[PDB]
Every structure is written in C-alpha cells, then in structure tokens.
Amino acid sequence: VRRAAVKILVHSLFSMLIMCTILTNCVFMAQHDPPPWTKYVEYTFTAIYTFESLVKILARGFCLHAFTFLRDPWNWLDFSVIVMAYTTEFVDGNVSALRTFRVLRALKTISVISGLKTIVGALIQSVKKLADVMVLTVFCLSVFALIGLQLFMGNLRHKCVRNFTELNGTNGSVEASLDVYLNDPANYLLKNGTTDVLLCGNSSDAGTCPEGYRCLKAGENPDHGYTSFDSFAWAFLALFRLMTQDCWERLYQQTLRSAGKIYMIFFMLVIFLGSFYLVNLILAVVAMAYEEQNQAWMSIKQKVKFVVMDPFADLTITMCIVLNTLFMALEHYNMTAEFEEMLQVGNLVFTGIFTAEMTFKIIALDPYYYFQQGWNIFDSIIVILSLMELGSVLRSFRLLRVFKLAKSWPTLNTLIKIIGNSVGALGNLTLVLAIIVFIFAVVGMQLFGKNYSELRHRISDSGLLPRWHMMDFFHAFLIIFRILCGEWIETMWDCMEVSGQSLCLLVFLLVMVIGNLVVLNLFLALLLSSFGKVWWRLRKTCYRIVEHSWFETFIIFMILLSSGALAFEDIYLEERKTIKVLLEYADKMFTYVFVLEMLLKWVAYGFKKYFTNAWCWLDFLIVDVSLVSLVANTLGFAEMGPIKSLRTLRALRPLRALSRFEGMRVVVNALVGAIPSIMNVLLVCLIFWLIFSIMGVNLFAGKFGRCINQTEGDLPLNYTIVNNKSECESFNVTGELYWTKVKVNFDNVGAGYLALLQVATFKGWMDIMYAAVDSRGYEEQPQWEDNLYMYIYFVVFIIFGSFFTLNLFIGVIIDNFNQQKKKLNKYQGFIFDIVTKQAFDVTIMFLICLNMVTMMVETDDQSPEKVNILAKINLLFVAIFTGECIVKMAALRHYYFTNSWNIFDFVVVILSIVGTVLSDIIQKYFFSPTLFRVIRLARIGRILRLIRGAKGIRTLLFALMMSLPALFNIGLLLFLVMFIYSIFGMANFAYVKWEAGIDDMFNFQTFANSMLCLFQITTSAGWDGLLSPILNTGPPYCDPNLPNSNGSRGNCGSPAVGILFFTTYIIISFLIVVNMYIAIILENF
C-alpha cells in the first residue's frame, strides 16, 4: 500500500529509471518529423511519466497529497506534462497548438539530478536579484532611444531613388507618386557588391548618390524593416543592439551614411558609454554572485632494476615532443613530394621513440601499480592512437602529446586545470549550460522548424536552404550556440521573416538573456575556481630654460601642432598646393625645433642622465627618423630605396605627446609594466592555438580554394561544371574561371593563426566557416553542405581556444594585478510651508514622467492631426516647467542657492524656450530642437539616489561615478592610438580597392574618413571587412597596375603590412581596454 509505494519510490533503481526515460526521450524529441514506426513510443513515455506521478501521489498516501506534498514547483511541471500529453492524445480539432510543449519534459532531468535542482534554483534567485539594475538599464536605453529617435527619425529610410518624379504622372501610377517612389525598389540602388539598398543624405557630410540618382526619403524601412530608428519601440531595439555590440558595425555604417559623418559622435558616445556601462553592469552582477558566495625468470628481473633506478630522460623526451610539434608545423598547403615523404618519416620516427619510451616506462616501473598514475594512462592512450593511426583527422591524434609540457610549464598546467575544472568541481554548472542549450535547441526547433522549411524562399537569397536555420536539430544547436557568442541579431531577422515578430522576440531574447546569464555564470565560476667658466655658464642657462614652464609648454603645444601636420598628409595634397608648400616649410622647422630640444636636454643633464629615461630614447628615435629623412633630401640620391619608409615612420610623432602628458604617461607605464606577465600567457595561447592551426591544416589545407567565373563573384556548381582544381584549369578555355583560395584560411600554420583569430574574436568567422564546412576534397570544389559536420571543430575550438584561453587570460591579469599591488508676502509664506512636503516633488516627477511618455509616443510622419496635438502638449509642457521653476525659485530666500540641480533646471528650460522661438533655423543647423527637451528626463535619476529600498542601483551608480575619470584617460590613449594608426593607414591604405568594409564613405583616403574606420575597429566590429581588400593581391578580384595620382601605383593593398596593421591594432586596443577596465576596477574595490 502507501508503505509499499514509499518503499519503491525512494529506491535507487527509480532515479536511474526516470533519468533513463528522460534521456531516451531527449534523443527522440530531438528528431524532426520522426517516422511513425518507432515514433509512437511517445505514449509509452506517457506511461512511464504517469506511472511515476501515480507512485508519487500514492507514496504520500491520501487526498491531501496534491495539497501538502506536491507544493514543490518542479512537480507542477510533472503534472503539466501529464495533463498536456493527455490533452493532446485523449482529446484534440488539432491546430497543433500544444505539441510545442513536449520539451517541458527535458527539465525533468533537472528535477531528478540532485544538483541541477540546486543550480537552477540559485540561478533564478540571481535573476531575481538583478531586477533593479535591469530597470535602471532599460531606463537608460529608453532615454537614449529617444535621443536616437529624435536625431535619426526616419533617417534610416533614405534611399537613392532613381532621379525621377519627372512631371505629371497624374500623380504617380507610373514607373517609367508614392506608388513607384515606394513600392518599386526597382527604382532604388543597391550598395556596391551587395544586395542592399543604398542609403544617402541631404547633409554635406552624409554619403551621396551617383549622378542621375535622387536622394528621396520615401522607401521601405532599412535592412528588413527591423532596424528603423523611427518610433520608440524600434528605437529601443536598435539601441539595445548597440549596447551589446551585436553587429552594430552594420547599423553604424547605415546611419552615418544617412545622417552624415558628423553624427559619429552619437555612436561614439553610445558605444563608449554603453560598453562601459555594460562592463559596469556585469561587474555589479558579478559582485552579487560573489556576495552570495561570501554569505554562504631471473634474467628479466635483473634488466628492469637497472632502468628504473637511473632516470634523467624527461629533459631529453620533452625536447623531442617540442621538436615533434615543430615538425608537424612545417606541413603546409603544397609540400613537395620529397618533403611530403620526408615529413611522414619523421612522424614514424617520432612515434617509435615514444612507443619505445612507453615500453621502457612500463617495465622499469611497475606494470600494474606504477602505470595506474593518471598522467601515464593518458600518455599511453596517445601512443596507442598513434599506432592505430599508422595501423583527414586520422593524423591529428599525435597533437595531444604537446600537453606533456604542462608538467614543466607553470602556465600550461594552469590552463589544463581550468579545462579539468570545467568538467570537475564546477562540472554541475557545465551540465546545466549543456541542458539549457539542448532545451532551447529543441524548443527552438519545435516552434520554428515548420516555418523555416515552408518559407525558405523568404529568408534565403537564392533558392537553397539558408545557412543558419532551426529545421535540423544539429543546425538548431548551432544557432543556439551562435546566440551564446553574442551574434543574435543577424539570425533574429531571418526567423522573424518566416515566424512573425511576436514569437521570435520572446524566445530569442529569452535565449539571449538566459544563455548569456548561464554562460557568464559558468565563465565566472571557472575564474573563481582557478585562483672652463664658459662651459659652466652654458650649463646654467640651458638648465634654466628647460626648467622654465613656458618652454615646456611651448614644446607641448609644438608637438600638438606637429601632429596636426600629419593630418593634412592625405591623398588631397596635390590639390591643396598652398598648404603643401607650408607643410614642407613646417616639416623642416619641426625637425629643427625637436632636434634643438634634444641637444638642450643633453647639455642640461649630460649623456648619462638623459639616456636613463625610456621616454628620452623614444623621443630620440622619432627625431632621428625625421633627421635621417631630412639629411637624405639635402645630401642627394633621393626618391630611391627605403626613403619612403622612413617618411611613413613619422606617424609616431604623436607618441612624444605621451611623455609630457601626465595622464597619458601614467597609463602607458602601467600597461607596459604588466607586459612580462602578459607575455608568458601569450605563449600558452600561442601553444594552444598552435594545436588547432596544425590540426586545421591537416583537416583543411587546400580544401578552401574554390572560386568560379568572374561575373558571378561566388563559387560555381560543385558537382556540375567544375569539381576539381585540375578540372577548373581544363575548363578555363575562357578567361572567366579563376581558382582562388579564400582570403583567410588555414593553408600554412602562420595563415592558420590568422584564421583562428577571426574565429576567436567572432568577427569574420562566417566566411571562414562556410569555406571550411563546405570542403569536399583536397583539391576539389566545395559542395554546398558536403562535410557539414565540420562546425564541430569550430565549436570545439571556440569553447577551448577562445573561451578557455580568455578565461585563463582574464585570470592571470587579475592575478598579476593583485600580486603587483601586494608586492609593493502671504504667497511666500505658503510656498515656504509647502516646499518641505515630499508630495510636491513627486508631482513634478509625474509631469516629467508624463512628458517622457509624450516623447515616447511619436513615430515618423504619424498624422497631420497628431503632430499638432503633440506639439501643443509639448508647448504646454515647456511652459509648465518654466512656470514651475520660477515660482519655486525663491520659496525660501536661499532656495536657488541650496540645490545645484535646481539652478541646472533653469539652464535647460531657457535653452528649450529659445529653441521653439528660434526654431526656423535651428532644425537644419542643430541635430533637432526637440532633442533638448530629453535632458529633463535625466533629472529623474535624482530620485534614484533618494529611494531607500534598492541598494543594487547604488553600487552600479557608485561604480560608474568612481571609475568615471579613468574612462576619459583610457579614451584619450585610445584616441591617440587611433590617430597614429590612421596616419600609418593613410600612407599605406590610400587607393585600396573599394571592396567590403572599405566602401566610398569609409576609406583610409582622408583623415576624417580614417578615424571613422579605426573607431569601429576599436571594439573589433568589422575588422574582418576592412582587412579583406587589403589582403588581396592580383586579379581576378584586384588590379596589379592602375594609374594613381600619387606615385603608389595600383589599387591593391599589401598583405604583409595589412595583416600586420590590423592584427596588432586589434590586439593593442584589446590590451588597452582590458587592462584598463580591469585595473581601474581592481583599484576601485
């Protein structure tokens, strides 16, 4: 009876039974459109679950069981699956509304494992704790959304409509008004080499259309109708995307085209503040988790004895694996046959040495007892695999031997601990992330699988399956995995086209919020776990002048002026003849003043004193390059060899500024001071990346090459006209078919390292992957999905190569900084009486809150009547505030004096009041007149400080305020780096073929343009795009010799420099931002 049910339920065959049942259900649920044959096991599963529920109810043993025993939430879920399966089967009439719920079972494994209950419970507790910070955050986004709304309302609609609107279409039912000016996108222009309608603009800065094309504003909304700035709801989404920096490079290029180059500051303000806010909000979230943790037969015997006693073989053996690793590294795309044969022999030779050592190791030590040591066991496994491999992922088994260095390497061993830790002590968290991804993958598949398959023409460019879709379970996992990376927006537009906006937004945002929350938690968990008289006279005067403040200041002004000269050294110099002569005249003066400065330093302190300082050496090098260039010009034999190169090097003039600026000098010193600690970790990443690049080469060298005819611009039919590289040559009767390898690929270990960087940073990974997962053969053309399972390598790489190393990298930096710190008048009476009451202040807030809603309701071209009504309300509001501020200005004699904010309120209203009156010229000159009124909203923040209840907001606010000064300082250094790179870029990258990231508006041609490209690259967005034109040399895509105005001939870019320029820049920015965000944070707490 009840006793027997209790006795049988807590039995441990039950946990394994139910767990097995859920697990087989997983494998059956994951199937899409299962064949009816095996499929109808479903109601047998219903039986097992119903049986379990029955047992649970009986074991509690009365009618009150469903009242006092199944109070637990996780059981409500069991009852849910029971009633739902029964509602689906016993009754229907079937519009398939319920079948979506089948996944609900998968959470039952979270119900049975005694650890996943604890973890998901603590996670939902943490979600509950991040509430007030999320309200502050959604408010900040609301404010800025309004800002973006009023600045670029409808601006993202602008389209280069073919100049038309000729006359008397009577009015517009003719294509050869709004009929054709809107619904005939055969009237618009597509951007260069893309399927994307060209934006444009009225502003001079904003990009403009080609002759015969008119920049009208009437068109459909921008990318897909999901990125328009106009209306508050869509504005909130676009700003959210900017905050998380998910594919914001694409949006930023679009808006900057429409609004103009001068609106960059908006994005600059949003990206710099938003990322700084996100970093601070993550830090606050991290603190809560940390806070929670805180709250908590004779002959054989003789032979073995001699070998075991004498060791000394690890030093020699370690050298062999290092050499072995370097031996496989030599393998590249086209190794000669002799070399190819030779390479194989080395591996065979190398395998024998290890096998021999293994045999010696087992005999010298104990075959049964000593071998059991865990490290030895794994080593033996590699040895057998190598034998098995010799007895194209087959040859990559040998790569595991590189990990043997961990015993001798302190940092590699630490990374090994982190990987081990993930599946070890923190293994429960890893499992939850795995299960959550599974739940989402099947939930996503069940909900959108029908839609993706049915409407694939909508989502896809051509009549073929879309690259990313949820129809297959494997594919669904990739999309869920991709969302974890932070690239959710590109896919979200695609699902919404087929699914509809309502559903996709609910799940994708949930996946984005939940997936990131668990991934961040897992990531943070690993980090926590890881832890004569004339001569005398000369000396006195020279010493005095250098010491004098004006002289020091004069040089500081001079360096800024010197830096300015570089800015005008772009491609328009020939046109600007007047400035050109001045620059030449100036250059000589600059060289002289700096050299004089250098000599003066020598006289004042002596050679020994001057040379000790690093900055003096830095100053010396720059003036030497300029002086050397100057002497070459004066001494003759000009315009030959490397003299042009010395000229490019004067882009380092801004560096001198760092020495004399106290803010720039302190930050630079700290960054370089921590370089030694960073360096060992870089080697570990290099070694970790080396395994993947070498593995990548075995798997992918030569597979990537794939081009077709020049006209198409993409690969030819794979199984049809061309199937092989050799075949391609045979068919090349016409000049059209060029067999070209993809720009970034693993064809060499060095090339492989570049490819990994793009994949690791998640920018440009798509092209690397499509070439990689479509690889068909060693020289064969890629088939559409042939060899699709390669995505696995990238997922394995991304989890280990980037996620673990970054976690290791973050950990060492945190560890290094801690150690470093450680190592070292009737009316007057009435106002006076009523001013004190709390309610009076509240009334103002309500009006302000109402005012926010008034601005929140405006779309683009909403109604003729609506704008007037809104304007009347807007006019009423400004008057209300002005009336209110004036009356309360002197409630008390010193009332205006007492609060600074009240005085500030007068300044916004006066600015606002003049705006309406002076609105005739203000809209064109300024961003908008209405934009000024959004400043009142910021006043609301004052109440946040006042509210007693939430401490979460205070920590975030305090953290931002305390760290506010430092953000400016790093930002200055970043700008200096941007300035240096653009000058370097301008000489090198001028006239680069306009492909990919370099369009017409974003170029390296002018300094104004270079700053925009460099700014986007600072956060790594679009680095892959900018790099691609630079990389290609020679036709079909590029042109070797094209006449150019400057001596530099041809539009091709240099690959060695191009790779060098961007990769260093991407890393330098990363170190500047990561070290400085981290150093400030550590110092603050």
Partner 1 sequence: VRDGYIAQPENCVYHCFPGSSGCDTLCKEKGGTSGHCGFKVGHGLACWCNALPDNVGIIVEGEKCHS
Ligand X SMILES: CCCCCCCC/C=C\CCCCCCCC(=O)O[C@H](COC(=O)CCCCCCCCCCCCCCC)COP(=O)(O)OCCN
Ligand Y SMILES: CC(=O)N[C@@H]1[C@@H](O)[C@H](O)[C@@H](CO)O[C@H]1O
Ligand Z SMILES: COCC(CCO[C@H]1CC[C@@]2(C)C(=CC[C@H]3[C@@H]4C[C@@H]5O[C@]6(CC[C@@H](C)CO6)[C@@H](C)[C@@H]5[C@@]4(C)CC[C@@H]32)C1)COC
Residues near ligand Z, by CB under 6 A:
279, 282-283, 286, 523-524, 527, 810, 814, 1077-1078, 1081-1082, 1085
Q: Token digits for 317?
A: 């053996």
Quote the CA–CA distance of 88 and 94 in Å, as a whole number. 8
Residue 874 within binding range of partner 1, rule CB under 8 A? yes
Quote the CA–CA distance of 135 and 279 in Å, as a whole number. 16
Quote the CA–CA distance of 759 and 768 in Å, as a whole number. 8
- Judged by CB under 8 A, the residue of 31, 44, 923, 1046 near partner 1 is 923
Cβ atoms 953, 285 nearer than 8 A = no
Give least dist CB 964 to partner 1, A: 37
Nearer to ligand X among residue 686 and residue 869 (C-beta): 686
Residue 921 contacts which entry, ligand Y, partner 1, ligand X, none (Cβ below 5-8 A, type-dependent): partner 1
- 3-class DSSP state for residue 295? helix
Q: Token digits for 858?
A: 């405006």
Residues 6+ apart with CB under 8 A from 913: 878, 882
Cβ atoms 665, 659 nearer than 8 A = yes
Nearer to ligand Z among residue 422 and residue 781 (C-beta): 422
∠ CA 987-991-996, rounded to 5°: 115
Segment 417-446, which members bind ligand X (CB under 6 A)? 443
Quote the CA–CA distance of 459 and 507 in Å, as a whole number. 18
Residues 6+ apart with CB under 8 A from 72: none
Residue 920 within binding range of partner 1, rule CB under 8 A? yes
* 1053 φψ region: left (φ > 0), alpha (ψ -120 to 50), beta (else): beta
Nearer to ligand X among residue 230 and residue 569 (C-beta): 230
Residue 137 within binding range of partner 1, rule CB under 8 A? no
- Judged by CB under 8 A, the residue of 871, 886, 887, 910 near partner 1 is 871
Residue 919 within binding range of partner 1, rule CB under 8 A? yes
- 3-class DSSP state for residue 790? helix
Give least dist CB 103 to ligand X, A: 8
Residue 921 within binding range of partner 1, rule CB under 8 A? yes
What are the helix and strand counts (H, E) for the chain?
48, 2
Residues 6+ apart with CB under 8 A from 669: none
Give least dist CB 994 to ligand Y, A: 4
Selection from 965, 1058, 1056, 1066 nearest residue 1016 by Cα: 1066
Nearer to partner 1 among residue 24 and residue 916 (C-beta): 916
- Judged by CB under 6 A, the residue of 1, 178, 233, 534 near ligand X is 233
Using CA atoms, how far residue 725 sits from 344, 371, 704, 708, 852, in Å, is: 25, 50, 11, 11, 63
Quote the CA–CA distance of 3 and 992 in Å, as a whole number. 83
Residue 994 contacts which entry, partner 1, ligand Y, ligand Z, none (Cβ below 5-8 A, type-dependent): ligand Y
Give least dist CB 531 to ligand Z, A: 8
Residue 868 contacts which entry, ligand Y, ligand Z, ligand X, none (Cβ below 5-8 A, type-dependent): none
Instruction: Classify each residue of 158-188 as buried b or exposed e, where b means 16 or more C-beta atoms within 10 Å of its C-beta.
Output: bbbbbebeeeeeeeeeeeeeeebbbeeeebb
Residue 100 contacts which entry, ligand Z, ligand X, ligand Y, none (Cβ below 5-8 A, type-dependent): ligand X
- Judged by CB under 6 A, the residue of 153, 237, 283, 695 near ligand X is 237
- Judged by CB under 6 A, the residue of 518, 708, 754, 790 near ligand X is 754
Stretch 674-713: interaction string toward ligand X, x if CB under 6 A: -----------xx--x------------------------
**What sign does the dihedral 138-139-141-145 (CA atoms) show?**
positive
Give least dist CB 744 to ligand X, A: 9
Nearer to ligand Y among residue 255 and residue 491 (C-beta): 255
- Residues lying near ligand Y in the complex (CB under 6 A): 158, 165, 192, 202, 210, 214-217, 723-724, 726-727, 779, 994, 1000
Give least dist CB 157 to ligand Y, A: 9
Residue 87 within binding range of ligand X, rule CB under 6 A? no
Q: Which stretch binds ligand X (CB under 6 A): 257-265, 455-463, 507-515, 795-803?
A: 507-515
Selection from 990, 1049, 975, 1067 nearest residue 648 by Cα: 990
Quote the CA–CA distance of 77 and 545 in Å, as a whole number. 82
Quote the CA–CA distance of 132 and 950 in Å, as a whole number. 7
Residue 868 within binding range of partner 1, rule CB under 8 A? yes
Number of residues that bind ligand X (CB under 6 A): 34
Q: Which stretch binds ligand X (CB under 6 A): 281-289, 633-641, 743-751, 783-791?
A: 743-751
Nearer to ligand X among residue 571 and residue 1030 (C-beta): 1030
Nearer to ligand X among residue 735 and residue 750 (C-beta): 750
* 603 φψ region: left (φ > 0), alpha (ψ -120 to 50), beta (else): alpha
Q: Which stretch binds partner 1 (CB under 8 A): 621-629, 649-657, 672-680, 863-871?
A: 863-871
* Cβ neighbour number for residue 308 with a 10 Å cutoff: 14
Residue 875 within binding range of partner 1, rule CB under 8 A? yes
Quote the CA–CA distance of 348 and 346 in Å, as a whole number. 5
Q: Token digits for 939?
A: 């006043």
∠ CA 630-636-638, rounded to 5°: 75
Number of residues that bind partner 1 (CB under 8 A): 16
Residue 867 within binding range of partner 1, rule CB under 8 A? yes
Give least dist CB 214 to ligand Y, A: 5
Residue 100 within binding range of ligand X, rule CB under 6 A? yes
- Judged by CB under 8 A, the residue of 533, 924, 948, 951 near partner 1 is 924
Site of interaction with ligand X (CB under 6 A): 97, 100, 134, 138, 233-234, 236-237, 240, 443, 500-503, 505-506, 509-510, 513, 685-686, 689, 748, 750-751, 753-754, 757, 1056, 1059-1060, 1063-1064, 1067
Residues near partner 1, by CB under 8 A: 861, 864, 867-868, 871-872, 874-875, 916-921, 923-924
